[PDB]
């Protein structure tokens, strides 16, 4: 996900001024076992900035199994790498040995493909050289505008007396059983007894809670959920004479 | 046993509250009923005891008060 | 601000500029229960003080990610506003993330530094030979060089290109408590609220111990996640929970700060 | 019971110990307890007890004295133990609602709501943490020494 | 893909079996417990799994030794000091109070459970352990 | 051109020499812009006096031992680096400290020449044993920031001379952090929390005023070039 | 041992759009943060003009096309973001670009009013045919940094007005390097050299002066 949108200035920048567009965490490379992003980043740098494998009298050794008509290349030079028989480690290593087309006449990266980044936040140059480059990145369909929900109070469903679920229908979130177990494991009794009553089912609770909060009074004691009343009435409709009574004196439905 | 200073909800510190009430589970109701009382006072009408903040909440006042030992509780 | 309820409802519905000055005054210590489905263990729900942020994302704490088993790889979370005073209390006392550092499993601190913070503090504290501003102990001609009156002096010597954070320097500390063996050999009567004693450490270990609490003794070791575990366990068993909550947060901030200048790329 | 009570813990910790996780025994022991809180009745019965049923230990001990019965130790599955409960609501909620509702309805058994999963269903404050009488009915009055000046 | 749902179902069963087991009272008072290993014959040693087995629990019997100079009595939370003191004392077994052997009818008694992991103190007298 | 409103500054003293200044509520970014500059200025820039090099009677080519004192040359050096001073010379002014017999040598026991003054006479240097006399010469210099042990054919060439790392900076330890604070609607408006520990000589406010002085005097050079498109106060 | 000499801010020039600046002498390791302050002031907050809302008389919203144009209205807006303009009056001023028949509509074909200047006439907007006629009015306002495309539903603005994501940043790029200059012995000093590269709305001098001014205003005592 997009953590922070850094105002371009504070984001770390290359010595020519070019401020880097994204930063990805290093720790999420070795454990996940996808160094493709790093090779793609490097060959990305090789691709973005124009390059010329300063040939020699008769070719360099590292580019022995290298393709012809791919010694020189200009700026924004699009590259193809066949997924299983594309560019290699020793090819990339030498390739990073490129020209310096940055309008200035100094190279930004090194032979190891590690640029000496400047921290826009502090102002200092980072004590070790960072793996900068040009990774092709994709915006996925998982966007906050779809996934973000909020509901203090709104419309309730007709058949089920809990808030109708959905992003589109201005709906609340599902407080499931595994959520109730965690709440019980704490022993936040009143919390659970609020969530599974006035904050969901209870028709007198859901109307009173809003009034009570907006007036700024005590939250009235959650009576009985519709989810109990429906079970009671269901069992009464199944001809099972269920009745409520304490130690001394019997209660009424 | 120094923590420099607490901030927001973690003020006052819980370990100094756990000394006052029997258990956290008591302390909850301890604070909550007091807070419901403090809520009621603005509208049992006793408090606030300690000098409250300008825009401060009843829970903060209640949880401050228990730490000060201005209150006493009976376990049913 | 509002003449009647309906105008307040309209004002907040419309998102007018006056609401934002109030919403912090309203949210001030009014905690929220954050949940991450699937809600496996007890800490899979935790209460938090909601700080307002501009955006459309929930800025979770990095430590509680293990307490949710929540990556930031598209994983959603569910906020719940506990309404009742009793609920607000339950949130604040029982399940406020600070108050329950220790997992209900081994009683080990679940809210401990992981991933970046770990390498940050590892780099911060780890010792390196042949470094900048190093302890030499020169013969005949020169003095010992790698010896500094204060951690302040060492910080000034670091920020100005002269001292490397991972150097076996000899610093004279005041605020910090020494190792258990060095407690006996030096003082063994008075304490050190503002006394003085010499330590052969790394600036980073001093900047580390500066995070750990006043009366906690010195470590002088590279901060492996296990070493952090036993340290925060010692803090958990010996000190109050708030001291742990804060010290592990300073370890988080420092850890992350030093994760950058670690050079893990 | 005491040896198998250790055996379960030993044999169910070893997997966590092997897979690099640490749980404290007491947690397992709360389950291994909930397993071994039943007895299988062989013969005699006394008070209309069936041969090869599942009856609770404490209530069996109260009958076993017979002031004026033969039951052996049994180790049952957590599903069978969760099925075997006094509270009809929980048993009805778990599995085979008809079977247990029919069995209960004829017996006309009065649910005490001692368990909490029923208190969740009926929606009353749960018997745990901050919902037990000794907690939820705490009377806090402000001290006369504090109320004096005010 | 399979593990999470299976673990969820296991969790569901393990919740729905021990849904009723709370800390009802403080102490029912029973001498019964379990005998933890804790340094079996030596050094002449610490067990690898003391932290899982012994730690954060109340003692069942008064910690008697060869002499009988009871270093620690029944009902101590078993901090490392206690364990290293009992290792130093010269006993190769310790009897600890367990929920396994708790004489409480309803739920369990606080003492028998031990020091709660969440709090780090003696378990509270309503916890849904 | 531009109009920023309310960049208010407030002080919060911790000790006599330690303070936290809060500058708020700055426009989204400005915290870090002026923060690290204020820090590195407070540290490196502000002019102050300090001990640049010392020489002790007896030590011609010794390790770290002085006849008739309990402490070591390293610990003495460490105690002397702490010896805070204020001079009006802008040149290497030489001071002499001599004490005979047993006990201790305090900061007040030194005799500072005309211009130089010690702000804390109640500061420990060394513990003297029976049948001994300490006679040490301290070279006090004016300067800016932190300057390590100089070997410019002065420390290296001379026999009894030993160089020490000069902390000219009146401020010892300045750190800083920033937090978001809502102002009208938007958040990410930065509130600078700048933490400073000074030496007794100058006050944090005066140090910050000096830093602000050298900074505004510096960026004045830039401002002067055009001075057309500006911000408000 | 002081370095009693105030820092000289000498102005070099590599191009008309981009220039170096050398500042010296300074305190060892003081340059980086000084340069950073300038950089962060520049890249963030410099007064600048840019397109705030465009209004093509034909099309009624962003997400359609004009008759007889190659690029769509979205891509035209996206190119009109790429314009670099400068205005004297900070109040909202309405430019006009009217072209009928065939050819390549460039930024140079725009007709600004008195006290508004376009600083990239060469830039390609849209390519037309004889069938197509492009009449577009571009509203410019003086601001600083970036603002989101302000909604015309909020303000008293008609359905015709299309908001565009304004970039009030006349600076394009800034960088710096600091020379060590002299060894540790005999008072070492750091000289900072900063490259400032503008869009041509204003010269590097004007920008750096504005930044310096902003920092001078922003350092209160
Ligand atoms: Mg994941
Ligand atoms: Zn018991």
Curated annotation (Swiss-Prot), chain A:
Family: Belongs to the RNA polymerase beta chain family.
Provenance organism: Mycolicibacterium smegmatis (strain ATCC 700084 / mc(2)155)
Note: Mutations in the RRDR sequence (residues 423-449) confer rifampicin (Rif) resistance. Rif blocks transcription initiation but not elongation.
Domain of life of the source: Bacteria
Residues forming coiled coils: none
Name of the protein: DNA-directed RNA polymerase subunit beta
Subunit structure: The RNAP catalytic core consists of 2 alpha, 1 beta, 1 beta' and 1 omega subunit. When a sigma factor is associated with the core the holoenzyme is formed, which can initiate transcription. Interacts with RbpA, which partially restores Rif-inhibited transcription.
Function recorded in the entry: DNA-dependent RNA polymerase catalyzes the transcription of DNA into RNA using the four ribonucleoside triphosphates as substrates. This subunit often mutates to generate rifampicin (Rif) resistance. Interaction with RbpA partially restores Rif-inhibited transcription; once the subunit is Rif-resistant however RbpA no longer stimulates transcription.
Covered residues, full protein: 885 to 1137 of 1169
Paired cysteines (S-S): none
Curated annotation (Swiss-Prot), chain B:
GO biological process: DNA-templated transcription
This protein's GO CC annotations: DNA-directed RNA polymerase complex
Coiled-coil ranges (or none): none
EC code: 2.7.7.6
Protein name from the UniProt record: DNA-directed RNA polymerase subunit omega
Family that this chain belongs to: Belongs to the RNA polymerase subunit omega family.
Function of the molecule: Promotes RNA polymerase assembly. Latches the N- and C-terminal regions of the beta' subunit thereby facilitating its interaction with the beta and alpha subunits.
Designated gene of the protein: rpoZ
Quaternary assembly: The RNAP catalytic core consists of 2 alpha, 1 beta, 1 beta' and 1 omega subunit. When a sigma factor is associated with the core the holoenzyme is formed, which can initiate transcription.
Keywords attached to this entry: DNA-directed RNA polymerase, Nucleotidyltransferase, Transcription, Transferase
Catalytic activity entry: RNA(n) + a ribonucleoside 5'-triphosphate = RNA(n+1) + diphosphate
Molecular-function GO terms, alphabetical: DNA binding; DNA-directed RNA polymerase activity
From Swiss-Prot, chain C:
GO BP terms in the entry: DNA-templated transcription
Residues that, per the record, bind Mg(2+): 71, 73, 75
GO molecular function, one term: DNA-directed RNA polymerase activity
GO cellular component: DNA-directed RNA polymerase complex
Record keywords: DNA-directed RNA polymerase, Magnesium, Metal-binding, Nucleotidyltransferase, Transcription, Transferase, Zinc
Similarity-based family: Belongs to the RNA polymerase beta' chain family.
Function: DNA-dependent RNA polymerase catalyzes the transcription of DNA into RNA using the four ribonucleoside triphosphates as substrates.
Quaternary assembly: The RNAP catalytic core consists of 2 alpha, 1 beta, 1 beta' and 1 omega subunit. When a sigma factor is associated with the core the holoenzyme is formed, which can initiate transcription.
Name recorded for this polypeptide: DNA-directed RNA polymerase subunit beta'
Residues of the whole record sequence present: 465 to 729 of 1317
Swiss-Prot record, chain G:
Region (Alpha N-terminal domain (alpha-NTD)): 1-221
Molecular functions (GO terms): DNA binding; DNA-directed RNA polymerase activity; protein dimerization activity
Annotated source species: Mycolicibacterium smegmatis (strain ATCC 700084 / mc(2)155) (Mycobacterium smegmatis)
GO CC field: cytoplasm; DNA-directed RNA polymerase complex
Enzyme class at the top of the EC tree: transferase
Keywords from the UniProt entry: DNA-directed RNA polymerase, Nucleotidyltransferase, Transcription, Transferase
Name under which the protein is recorded: DNA-directed RNA polymerase subunit alpha
Described purpose of this protein according to its UniProt entry: DNA-dependent RNA polymerase catalyzes the transcription of DNA into RNA using the four ribonucleoside triphosphates as substrates.
Family: Belongs to the RNA polymerase alpha chain family.
Source species, domain of life: Bacteria
Domain notes: The N-terminal domain is essential for RNAP assembly and basal transcription, whereas the C-terminal domain is involved in interaction with transcriptional regulators and with upstream promoter elements.
EC number of the protein: 2.7.7.6
Keyword flag Nucleotidyltransferase: yes
